[model samples]
Target: ENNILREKFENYARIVFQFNNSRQANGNFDIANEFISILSSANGTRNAQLLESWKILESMKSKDINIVEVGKQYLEQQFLQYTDNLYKKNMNEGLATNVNKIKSFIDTKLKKADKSWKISNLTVINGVPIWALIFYLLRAGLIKEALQVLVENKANIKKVEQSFLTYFKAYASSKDHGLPVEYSTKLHTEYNQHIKSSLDGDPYRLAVYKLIGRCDLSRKNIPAVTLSIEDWLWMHLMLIKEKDAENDPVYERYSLEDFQNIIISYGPSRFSNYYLQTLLLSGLYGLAIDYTYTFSEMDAVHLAIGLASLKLFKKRDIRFANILANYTKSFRYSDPRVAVEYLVLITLNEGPTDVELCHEALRELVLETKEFTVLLGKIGRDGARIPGVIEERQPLLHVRDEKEFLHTITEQAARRADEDGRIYDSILLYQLAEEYDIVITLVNSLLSDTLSASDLDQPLVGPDDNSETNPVLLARRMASIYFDNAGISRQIHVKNKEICMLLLNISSIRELYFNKQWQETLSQMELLDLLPFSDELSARKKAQDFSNLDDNIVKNIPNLLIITLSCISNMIHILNGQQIDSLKNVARQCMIYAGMIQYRMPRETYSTLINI
Candidate 1:
């Protein structure tokens, strides 16, 4: 038992470390492959007999390049692990991909099991769902009911926390197989037990601390000890679910002290997107409404929490922002350029106000901060790297040597992002300015830099040779560049209403084939030349907005229309965003493949795609 627990502890630590580690080092490691290998091995157990495929992971364990390529090594091998089992399970079950048959087969299994589902004895979910459910129950005014559920299910919730801890440990240790489903059920029980105890214990109150602590571990931040009443109130100032709702026992019982500490001490910057989103998704809307701050002051907090949430929650800001101005930046704290990425999707998938609010928050942040500039650069072909962020993953011995900013300024900006994007951007700008003061150290070997012909030729594959390229490898590389540069192609910084101006005028004279929304697409397109930094862009939106208003408007609106419209629409899709209409979307996605003649192409190269 001792040995098993020791291994488990180490494994958990390893997983926690790796996950934390992946953020820095310029994100160029193949550790993900190692982690995936471990998971696949775990999943391979049982009658499915998936463990046989462990051979694929052996190469990714080192610089073998024999099993899989470096970056490709992890993703390819990992994907195969699940797909392989999926294939085997189906074949063994003698079930084809026939939809009706598959449904019937599932029903037959239920009958065989006497209408009961089996819990595989695998660990999953930590104390997350327990707290999450509790937080929601508290926020949604399901306090008494939630407390009842907790009383009945305390044991299950604890098991959930333990199961999460257990899985985290297994994942860290690089175990290949997966945890059994049974473990998750037990963990759920444990979580409930913990919840019951903490309820009057101010259980929901501790959520802020736990989340901040997780952020503390991930971002290397140590939270503060105290806060003034105003600061505490500011953090919780989001509007209430029901405007006239009275502060009931639930509000009185829910403690704000831990969250206050989180703000004054750590703020939200120390967290990964996973933890942040959990906080929001757990009960964000209810929390927002219950919060005392207006959407304006809460904007920054929402941005910080929202961006962090995107790392884990897909439906980030689904209910928070009244008008999403820049849906692109909705969850892109890591790469601020991505903040406006989903605007096209908002226009296409959601309605107008959603996209509008997304843009508004982002627009406000941009005008307010310099870090937003760097973040934008990061998302674009300009490519940004948070200067000191790479040092965050240093070993325990080397941690002190990490630049002062990771712990100090970065955290501050993260807090600003937590409290306000404009402030976060401003803080980021200060750091960026300070960065100009440093002298860059160049490695003489050149091997420490990006891959080259010398790498592939190395007899050992380390610091010797870097020159190398492969055909299949070359095409994928060029494709990625096109993908990266594609964001700026669809300038999304304009007002959706502005885009409407272009289309309405153009449609009257010509049938415009647009993507996303006919009206919203116009707004996206209008933003390309909306940059204040550029002399050419100052009159960009204004020219479009007022151009065709007068019959005798003295400008060449039609010719100018195509230039701005096409430019903005192109860049949006490159960043994982949807577009207004099929024509514009397809055209841009296809245009990327047309190959950049003036740019670089790889018809004859051989190498693993790096830092992708």
Candidate 2:
């Protein structure tokens, strides 16, 4: 009895594991047989009952452990046993009769199957029976057996080739087949070769090629050499999923048409952002935006997501501005130069009151090192002035006229404002990181001319002015936006705080002046006194230690124009009223302060201070 039970137990385990592995591979199995096998393993005598009782007792005696997880696990095990019993009862009833008949028929036929691959059935009648038998085996989840029979008898070449393709369809689909990678690849190659040899101009070739590409992409080792355009796009998709860029050479081989094809293939899907970046860089902002509008509403997307990618902007094609406006709504753009373009668009559309759009555009630029390097190359190529220290031998962008190149960027951006029907939001993305030169150029771009003495004395015109173009207000709006973003402020508030504070103070003073609050304007001038100097260079002493403050924020506030403005406002206010001696003394101190820094200001700016 013991020996018989042991043999049954061993057989039960073998059949159960065989079912598991094979079911996983070919994805075929009957629950009835599985339950039957398990039941046969369950019944036993003294030794079996001893093992079974101990197992049941182990689960039943959970008094020592009363945790919820333990109770849940015990119940899960019991439920599994209940399912096995339910399956056993159903299979052993009326279903068993038909199941037995089918099992017997399969067993008898398989026993008669030709073991030696040397079957002599070749004529029409015999061939039909032989083919039928092999197909039955294939349908019964015996793909390997059916394939073996096909390989042994090639009397009908076309029929056998057709069967091979069918077998592989199942073979490639299941990952649990445990087949070797090389073996599977070899089979697919043969299958492709067979199809090409047998069928002339078959459209299945593309399907086959795509399948093979998918295989190579998915499988490790045994990769392919060439890729079609779609295949190349597939490669890019896989490359990004793995966060790998070693395939750039593959990307460089494609073209604009290829980008269009893939981008058109799907809307707002993967790789669309890369295409959008390509479009914007190529100056195909119109195409870039058309692609974006295909999937999402304009306000909720990041169209410039790929702006910082390794690819370069190579488009010189003519395009539309409204599409570029859509790009801005996709995200808040930060580069001053690029922002200048949108600001131009807004100003053209809405004039001086377009502060929200201007604010959205002026977030400071952020770039990875590689992105910055590429941008430097673009700037040099465009002949924009380079910012920061370069080696003495460093060269500028190759444009014959740097000013002209700067004009081109601004004018293109500005001209697009006339592009009617373009909707803008509070954010836009800068294609490249910024340089101080770019910001200065952008600010300069909005101005029709330098700040004339007449311009300073003149109050800002309303949007109603057909010729309304206030560069001061334009710069002030951008500065306000820049200071508003905490992330941007943290990065720039120190190096550019004097600029920021100056803009803020100027805007405040102007608002007071606009409202006819000369006294308030005089009081606001006092805020400028908080900044003693722009930096330690002007302080001419050991730098102030601000270690006690959050180094993450701005430190040692300073400004040149604020002091200059305070002096100017005081003198102007005195002209309006009976001046107290205190006001007179403060004005004297303010002018002396301006005198100390007047030469250091821009020659243009110094003239404005003196003229006022």
Candidate 3:
């Protein structure tokens, strides 16, 4: 959509604006002004008065200047200077009569070399060289210079040419460059009697006659001058004069509107590659963007943005907005940050519906990159804050609230990670989302698996000291980091909170047992109540509840019991009094619990419990 294109182009234009500002700061006002003029032309505000106004405003040095008066004076000066340069260049270099060189060369080659050769056989029209010069001067909008060309060649003029010279002088001398009704009537009569019907005559003479008399308005008979597309359009623009009170009925009056209609009738294929020039020259700026888009999206979008910035299009139109959204969507993956900048421009003037689209896009980007700390900033434990990517002054999207938006996206990413079996990543995302309940549940699940296969004799910190490679130690540390925080712990559900605590306690028991902290090991194991301890009733109840416990924990019951027995055996050797009796009671409790447990234990584990 062009709306998408418009947005992308607007972003590009803003970048150019910054570049221009930088250039201006470096005192390159000439280059800056040239860029401004180009920008103004692209914006469809290339009128001399409008350009002067913009230039004065941009300069910021001129105050309260009369832009129209200054623009008029500037145009007059430029026109006079252009005419002076044209006369000097054409007249001094003898370019106006340079066609004679070819004529003289042909005469010498044909007449001198062979008397039988005739110049009349040549189809290429070469008339009195002054006629070609007059046509060229008229096409340049230099009527006075054309008259001077005619005056210089007056001795060679015939009766018909004399009448045209009289009319040309009258037309050039008039204030509006229009001849009186009497003179135009006589000129039209002369055009019809001689130039209009003479195919053998020089085409430049016909062009000059038609131009001076303003006859045959629909005819494109000026091939001698209309060499380029601009020249053709320029010739037509000159031929289509506004109707006046003294217009004669004999001549057809073609208005500017009529010319535009003719151009429109030609359609897109007529001009093909020249559509931009044709449409722009005809003041069809909107159509120019549309047609150009068919060939060059980049050029079309830039044109649309330029016109839209000047407020040339309808203010309430959603077309540009749609274009921008589409452009943003297309580049979402390739350049997300640049896409966001375009969407930001859309949100500046768009509705809530579009704003929500921006939010959806941003959320998608966040999930895609999964760099929460880098893309979406977070506050650290030390009270330092990191800024997010969407750091705009005005809110870039419409949402119920910022926290809710963050929570929704983070939760989505967490769910994806959870589905993909990235338990650690999921746990961390849930924690970032402030979904502590889910974090606790996930951590509980992780630690369960860690406990099932972990070696009780192995230390939490391995020899390499890279706990990350060990899921058991990693899960233990994550659970501690998350659950030990009082602020976060208060928010977790009480049941899940207890489950996570028990899982962490089991891990701690293993660590204590491995480190030979028998007293602490027994104390932590008592919290889990996994062994029967001193109560036979509690042992049977705990064994019956084994089926309801997490599978990982239920599977590891035998290992826990053996570790508890080992801790008790070590304490018995170190203790002297009732502590030994208490340790022996705990050891006996372990055997009873093993027998009452529903899960089948290894035969070796049972023999070890008995031996302990």
- Predicted model with the maximum TM-score: 3
Candidates in order: C-alpha RMSD to true structure: 32.4, 25.6, 10.9
| Model 2 agreement with the true structure over 1-612: per-residue lDDT tens digits | 568533543453344344334433555543234433344455434224223322322342324432222323343344334334444543333343322322333333332365322222222234233343343343233445545555555655453455454444454455313233335455557645653334332222223333333333333221221123223333233212111224333331333344345555654445332444333322344465455454433211122212111121222221222333444443323332332233233222223334334323321121211122222222322233353211111121222353343334333433342253111100011212333333433443333133312323435555532321345555554465554556545655354455444444655665566455556766665565432233334332212422222221222122333434544455555443454555545445444444554453334334235435
Clash pairs (backbone) in predicted model 2: 282-315, 332-427, 332-428, 333-428, 333-429, 345-417, 360-426, 380-397
Q: After superposition, how far is residue 115 of candidate 1 from its true place, in Å?
A: 18
TM-score of each: 0.16, 0.23, 0.54
Candidate with best lDDT: 3
The runs of at least 3 residues in candidate 3 whose Cα sits more than 4 Å from the true structure, single-residue gaps closed, are 1-217, 233-335, 348-357, 363-387, 391-394, 398-433, 454-490, 510-523, 527-530, 534-559, 565-584, 599-612
- The residue-by-residue lDDT of candidate 1 on 1-612, one tens digit each, is 568533543453354345334433335344334434554545322201112212322332345332112323333333334334444554345444332232233334321276442312212244223443433332323334434434544566553343344533342233222234344345434444663234233323244223211211222221231122221222242111122124332231222333334543643344322222223322233332223132222232323232222231222333445323433343345444333332222322234565455444444544444344443322112344433322322231122434452334344444455465343243334334332111010110111112222212222224532221322222223223322453532332233223333333432222232322444445444443321223333444344444344222222232333333343445444453454454454334223222221123223211112101
The lDDT per prediction is: 0.32, 0.36, 0.58
Candidates 1 and 3 compared by lDDT, better number: 3
> Per-residue CA lDDT of candidate 3, range 1-612, in tens?
468555645656566444334432553333225435554655442233234333422432232323222322333333344445444443243343423333343333232356433422222323435665565455545567778878777767775477777777877887534748566777777787877887567666777777666777666557444555545666676665564623566446766567678888989678645555556555565666666566555445444544443443451122555555565555556565555555554443446765676676667666765655555555334232344655431244544485567667778877898788877667667656667687667767766765765473445544754553355565555556656678776878887867766776777677677666888988888877666787677777876777787655666676787777776776677533364677777777677777665347645454364344
1 against 2, candidate with superior TM-score: 2
Candidate 1, overall lDDT? 0.32
